[PDB]
Ligand binder design. Structure first.
Ligand SMILES: [Zn+2]
Ligand SMILES: [Zn+2]
Ligand SMILES: [Zn+2]
Ligand SMILES: [Zn+2]
Lengths: 261, 154, 611, 355
């Protein structure tokens, strides 16, 4: 009855992969796609009850991606390749939006997980986890919405695993710390698949007996809106929760004067 | 209820005899008839059966359950003073009245006007003070004549 | 035809129709009927089968009923014709009804109520609307002898004829052989010889649905009809009889098993009827009352079965009873009637409507077929499990507890071969320990403990060692009621040991824990009736399915086991289950008697001393 | 006379977001539960006590989920007296443990509104003005014993600006209605366990802020998870203050959370500092309640036939076959019933709006 779902979100920002391609490094987007497909095939291999969900995170939208080889594996790989080529071939940069819709892809993944769980019969319990690979830079404006995702997963007790390739994201670190998922940056991009298999492939119960690298240290500093500097102790607004370094009689954000006689 | 007895009682012919039915979006009244007790005793108030012990005990059980269930405002109208007093005495002897007192405070009217006034005042004070108050009166008594019950009293 | 597996191949004679799940009944051509309780039409089929068929087995899901000539007679006298019965059967039968069963029903119903027996002017007449039947029946020699003879020995001449009083039951049996059963119908409203009585129903009287249903089935078209109604003890069966008597309102005679039964009947009549106590008398040897003006006379079979000379006043009262003709007669504990002395009582008394009430109807001597015409057809039998569901009676928790035999005791038991083996296994030290543990556990639970022991010696030893009240043969009635009230009122003493007299010799206060140690030895109805009478409906645990606890101690590897399975079979017919409890949890920690075998061998000494 | 004749032959026949208003940013909630005789009644299976305590644990979980910086106090009123079962604090595990322990309580006596309210007021008498003072009471029995006048206590509570909410079980009580109305709270009646859960969920959300409520610039510190490693020579363990006041061995960890104001060490968050009174929180805790500041408006339910657009859900690509399809207000996307319910209930953000 153990139904393991491993939703994989792929950072499919064309700009970062173009930068990497111009660098002519050993690792490209094709290798990333191949590693993701192999990991998903292995996940489906480990048990019949296991399910695979692959969604590509792109700036324009979040795409639901899904001869001597397994029939279902071959069909799934064909579908994934078809969808990714259809998206990237028609991926026309129209606008200055560079940050990928990371939050939207996570929200769509959570909706898909909820729909699967509703479709899952009471006879079986569907353990769910999400693995996200980070390649491009992190986004700022999504932060709040990103937070809305995190607790939501913690609402349904879903692990969130982060695989940073190039650009670190403290948001991902905090999400992994909160939801209990694993955060780790790949030192050598060509070795990505083994990092996926050795660490992110086993389930948490399997991870329980397994010995794994300790989680990275996570900080929780704050930005003082008037200057957005690091702050240890700050003045918290009781109206709109805006934080200030110095005492103020009127809050800039809530526009409500602090009635301190 | 009868629109023709009054022209006969008052010996006249009224011009208009019209009854205005009540239309309620929300039901505020729940009239119920209980002719059978817990022991399936045929509940009656005929003076031949008014002295029956079974009827008195079933009335006591009904009042006890209502006090344990229904909110503070409880009023009970009997048929005569002597019958009500005998029923109260029987309830005290049986001990059913003691449980009713344990659940809600009880107030019984007498023939004294001042005593009945004090009883009404205490009943209203208890009802407005959150403690269950039960009043016992007669259909021909002063309570049924000129006393009005609010939502939290009736 | 029989299959190689032994089952009867009735498939050929049963044309199955496609309305399988819709229709709940199977009608085998043997006369048996099967019903499924889970069917949505269960209630309708239940009532139909009860009206037409005599129930046999009623377990949880599937029930078996049987068709008998007496059952068909009861159905006809209720007022149902052949066509309606056939139509309803075919509407409920899963398969087609075999033509043999159809023909059997036709033959039975075509002649039911044909012959009429009338008790008028203290004389019994046989009449009918078919004089050819009567004339042809005159050829029967038994009918010739039963027919009243003139003063010169000649035979007395819809014209009826008088029949000898002594030869009623002979005619009863003979008519069955004549395939023309008599009709026990009374002029309920057309009565003029016996006026009514100032007796009515108190408003406190409540008719539960099954009670009212049985009464109305008895009152076929408003006329009372003789029969037998089976209700569990304490289900208002006495109240049902009182209600029937009030309905009849004619002269009423009631017979009970013992004096306690007479007292209870009088109390019930006072408790629910409006008859003045001046008209209620007890024809007993202790409380003597004038029979004159006694609207309802209550007595016992022995008081009427005394072949020996009675007291002079008793003779006068018997003369008064014989002279008076009774509109209603009531007999309790019908299962004791088939005895010859009690059967003679029916001949002795001249009454119109005789109604019998009891808890069981399976006499171990199979003398029940005659009872079908001693009184009449079985009118009603409430479903015990159904009454349990409605909460009218307690939902009993039955259990059989097996007790290992001590090696010395078992060797002695095997050594003896005669009837004397009873003492050894009834005095099993392990059985004693089990009973003691049960008593301790239920007293700690504050339960009403009643322990039965048919053997006199075993009862004495058990009760004395456990230091509890014991009642047996002597049973001084004053001290008997003293002990009963001590059990009822004193919470310190709630463990009563009762001998065989606990069946019907006195009144059992309602209890919750009944432990049976020794039984008659196959009286499947006697101890089942004892269980039914002991355990009554109790408030507080009605929601739970186990609010009454019954334990039956049986010694392992003894013949007693063979009795228990033989006996509780009757209770199996009512769906009751008995879970085997080989070992009792908790006996180890609590100290009990006979912990040492050295005590047990002294007990063996004591037992063998009495052979 | 029903015995005249009767046959069953004929029986045998073939056949709620409010406006963009200020809310309870900081809440000090006290839960008072009756322990009277009537708690053993079977209004809710199995009895009032068991269902009440289970739903209370669920309420505590949800309330701490949606109110990170709040507090919960548990008081049990029985035998005309009140027992301070649990102190006002923010630990969910301790309160759940206390409720599980109290599952086996003794339901006896009658509730005492006066004593419980007086204890709650005394506890909340010194609370800061900016923090809201809200009390929730579960009333089983209809009778309360008052060792003094109750309306004077009502006046004192109103002067103390302490909100009182009542959720009864039997029927409406005039005194409870007056108490709820005068102090600004709400009075509710339980219809069943589902309605009980609905009322508890409605009470989970922060109440609308009163006009008289103050708006002060409160000062809070945000320490990090300073973990000391034995590879460092400055790995000096110290028993946590929260664990120190414990029967068992307090957690002697090398590192953890150190107060930025008085260097107090705590192994659990969010916990207000015992020594200097500093409210030690974390950044996610503040952002955890932002959905209250920005509620998601209900989507437009349109029949599928009248919806002349796409036939797949935007959130799950589900082939929409239901008679009702929910369209977003902002980006006007296509969502099925399941996604429409879940996003508003849990996600609180429309992905298309983010896009
Ligand atoms: Zn502000
Ligand atoms: Zn501090
Ligand atoms: Zn959807
Ligand atoms: Zn939207």
């Amino acid at each position: 009855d153990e139904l393991n779902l491993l939703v994989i979100v792929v950072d499919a920002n064309p700009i970062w992969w173009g930068k990497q391609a111009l660098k002519e490094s050993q690792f490209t987007l094709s290798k990333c796609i191949d590693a993701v497909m192999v990991l998903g095939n292995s996940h489906l291999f480990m048990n019949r009850s296991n399910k695979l969900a692959v969604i590509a995170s792109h700036i324009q939208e979040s795409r639901f991606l899904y001869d001597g080889k397994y029939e279902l594996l071959t069909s799934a790989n064909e579908v994934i390749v078809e969808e990714i080529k259809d998206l990237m071939t028609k991926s026309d940069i129209k606008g200055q939006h560079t940050e990928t819709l990371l939050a939207g892809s996570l929200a769509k993944a959570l909706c898909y997980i909820h729909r699967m769980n509703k479709e899952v019969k009471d006879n079986q319990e569907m353990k769910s986890r999400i693995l996200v690979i980070k390649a491009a830079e992190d986004s700022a404006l999504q932060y709040m919405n990103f937070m809305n995702v995190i607790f939501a997963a913690q609402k349904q007790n879903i692990l969130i695993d982060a695989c940073v390739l190039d650009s670190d994201s403290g948001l991902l670190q905090q999400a992994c710390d909160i939801t209990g998922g694993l955060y780790l940056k790949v030192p050598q991009m060509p070795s990505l698949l083994q990092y996926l298999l050795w660490v992110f492939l086993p389930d948490q119960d399997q991870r329980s007996q397994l010995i794994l690298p300790p989680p990275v240290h996570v900080d929780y500093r704050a930005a003082c809106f008037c200057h957005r500097n690091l702050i240890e102790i700050g003045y918290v607004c009781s109206v709109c929760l805006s934080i200030f370094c110095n005492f103020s009689p009127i809050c800039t954000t809530c526009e409500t004067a602090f009635k301190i006689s | 209820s009868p629109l023709d007895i009054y022209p006969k009682i008052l010996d006249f012919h009224p011009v208009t005899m019209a009854t205005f039915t009540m239309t309620l979006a929300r039901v505020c009244l729940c009239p119920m008839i209980i002719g059978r007790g817990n022991d399936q005793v045929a509940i009656s108030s005929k003076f031949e059966t008014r002295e029956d012990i079974a009827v008195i005990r079933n009335y006591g059980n009904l009042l006890l359950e209502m006090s344990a269930v229904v909110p503070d405002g409880i009023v009970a109208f009997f048929t005569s003073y002597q019958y009500m007093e005998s029923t109260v005495a029987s309830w005290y002897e049986q001990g059913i009245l003691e449980n009713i007192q344990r659940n809600k405070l009880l107030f019984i009217e007498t023939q004294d006007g001042a005593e009945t006034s004090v009883a009404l005042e205490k009943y209203q004070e208890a009802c407005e003070n959150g403690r269950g108050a039960i009043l016992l009166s007669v259909a021909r008594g002063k309570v049924s004549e000129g006393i009005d019950f609010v939502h939290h009293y009736g | 035809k029989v299959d190689e597996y032994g089952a009867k191949d009735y498939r050929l004679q049963m044309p199955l129709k496609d309305d399988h799940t819709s229709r709940p009944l199977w009608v085998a051509p043997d006369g048996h009927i099967f019903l499924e309780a889970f069917s949505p039409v269960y209630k309708y089929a239940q009532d139909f089968l009860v009206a037409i068929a005599e129930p046999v087995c009623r377990p949880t899901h599937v029930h078996e009923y049987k068709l008998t000539a007496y059952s068909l007679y009861a159905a006809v006298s209720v007022g149902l014709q052949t066509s309606d019965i056939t139509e309803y059967l075919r509407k409920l039968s899963k398969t087609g009804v075999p033509d043999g069963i159809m023909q059997f029903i036709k033959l039975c119903t075509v002649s039911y109520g044909k012959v009429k027996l009338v008790l008028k002017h203290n004389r019994y007449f046989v009449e009918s609307c078919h004089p050819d039947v009567i004339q042809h029946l005159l050829q029967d020699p038994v009918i010739r002898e039963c027919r009243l003879r003139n003063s010169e020995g000649e035979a007395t001449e819809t014209v009826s004829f008088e029949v000898k009083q002594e030869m009623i039951e002979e005619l009863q049996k003979r008519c069955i052989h004549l395939e023309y059963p008599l009709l026990a119908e009374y002029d309920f409203r057309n009565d003029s010889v016996n006026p009514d009585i100032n007796i009515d129903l108190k408003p406190t009287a409540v008719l539960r649905p099954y009670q009212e249903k049985s009464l109305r089935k008895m009152f076929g078209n408003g006329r009372a009809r003789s029969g037998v109604i089976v209700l569990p003890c304490g289900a208002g069966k006495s109240l049902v009889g009182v209600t029937a008597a009030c309905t009849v309102r004619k002269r009423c005679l009631v017979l009970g098993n013992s004096a306690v039964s007479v007292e209870q009947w009088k109390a019930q009549f006072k408790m629910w009827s409006t008859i003045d106590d001046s008209q209620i008398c007890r024809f007993t040897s202790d409380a003597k009352d004038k029979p004159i003006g006694c609207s309802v006379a209550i007595s016992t079979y022995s008081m009427l079965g005394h072949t020996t000379k009675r007291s002079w006043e008793a003779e006068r009262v018997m003369e008064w009873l014989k002279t008076q003709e009774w509109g209603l007669m009531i007999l309790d504990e019908v299962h004791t009637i088939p005895a010859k002395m009690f059967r003679r009582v029916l001949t002795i008394v001249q009454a119109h409507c005789k109604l019998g009430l009891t808890a069981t109807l399976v006499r171990e001597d199979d003398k029940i077929v005659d009872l079908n015409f001693l009184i009449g057809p079985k009118l009603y039998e409430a479903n015990w499990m159904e009454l349990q569901n409605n909460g009218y009676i307690a939902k009993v928790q039955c259990a059989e507890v097996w007790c290992p035999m001590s090696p010395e005791f078992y060797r002695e038991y095997v050594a003896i071969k005669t009837k004397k083996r009873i003492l050894l296994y009834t005095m099993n030290p392990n059985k004693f320990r089990a009973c003691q543990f049960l008593i301790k556990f239920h007293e700690r639970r504050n339960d009403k403990i009643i322990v039965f022991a048919d053997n006199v010696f075993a009862l004495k030893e058990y009760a004395i060692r456990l230091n509890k009240p014991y009642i047996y043969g002597p049973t001084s009635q004053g001290e008997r009621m003293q002990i009963l009230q001590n059990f009822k009122h004193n919470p310190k003493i709630n463990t009563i040991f009762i001998s065989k007299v606990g069946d019907t010799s006195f009144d059992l206060p309602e209890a919750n824990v009944l432990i049976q140690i020794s039984s008659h030895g196959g009286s499947r109805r006697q101890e089942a009736q004892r269980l039914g009478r002991v355990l009554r409906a109790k408030k507080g645990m009605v929601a739970e399915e186990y609010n009454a606890f019954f334990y039956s101690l049986v010694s392992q590897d003894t013949q007693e086991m063979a009795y228990s399975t033989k006996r509780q079979r009757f209770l199996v017919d009512q769906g009751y289950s008995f879970k085997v409890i080989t070992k009792l949890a908790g006996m180890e920690e609590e100290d009990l008697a006979f912990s040492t075998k050295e005590e047990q061998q002294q007990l063996l000494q004591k037992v063998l001393a009495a052979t | 006379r029903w015995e005249g004749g009767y046959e069953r032959t004929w029986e045998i026949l073939k056949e709620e977001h409010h406006g963009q208003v200020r809310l309870g940013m900081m809440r000090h909630l006290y839960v008072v539960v009756d322990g009277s005789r009537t708690m053993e009644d079977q209004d809710l299976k199995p009895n009032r006590l068991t269902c009440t305590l289970k739903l209370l644990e669920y309420f505590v979980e949800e309330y701490f989920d949606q109110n990170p910086i709040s507090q919960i106090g548990i008081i049990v009123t029985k035998s005309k007296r009140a027992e301070k079962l649990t102190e006002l604090s923010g630990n969910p595990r301790k309160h759940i443990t206390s409720l599980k322990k109290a599952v086996d309580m003794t339901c006896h006596g009658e509730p005492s509104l006066y004593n419980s309210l007086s204890i709650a007021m005394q506890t909340l008498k010194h609370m800061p003005g900016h923090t809201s003072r809200e009390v929730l009471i579960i009333f089983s029995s209809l009778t309360t014993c008052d060792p003094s006048n109750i309306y004077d206590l009502i006046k004192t509570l109103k002067a103390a600006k302490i909100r009182v909410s009542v959720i009864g079980l039997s029927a409406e009580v005039r005194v409870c209605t007056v108490l709820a109305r005068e102090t600004g709270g709400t009075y509710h009646v339980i219809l069943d366990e589902s309605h009980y859960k609905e009322l508890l969920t409605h009470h989970v959300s922060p109440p609308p802020a009163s006009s008289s409520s103050e708006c002060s610039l409160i000062r809070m510190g945000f320490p990090q998870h300073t973990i000391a490693s034995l590879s460092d020579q400055d790995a000096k363990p110290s028993f946590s203050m929260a664990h120190l006041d414990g029967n068992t061995e307090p957690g002697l960890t090398l590192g953890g959370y150190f107060c930025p104001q008085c260097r107090a060490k705590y192994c659990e968050l969010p916990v207000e500092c015992k020594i200097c009174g500093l409210t030690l929180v974390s950044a996610p805790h503040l952002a955890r309640s932002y959905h209250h500041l920005f509620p998601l408006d209900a989507f437009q339910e349109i029949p599928l036939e009248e919806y002349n657009g796409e036939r797949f859900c935007y959130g799950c690509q589900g082939e929409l076959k239901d008679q009702h399809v929910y369209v977003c207000a902002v980006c006007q996307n296509v969502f099925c019933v399941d996604c429409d319910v879940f996003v508003h209930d849990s996600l609180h953000c429309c992905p298309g709006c983010i896009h």
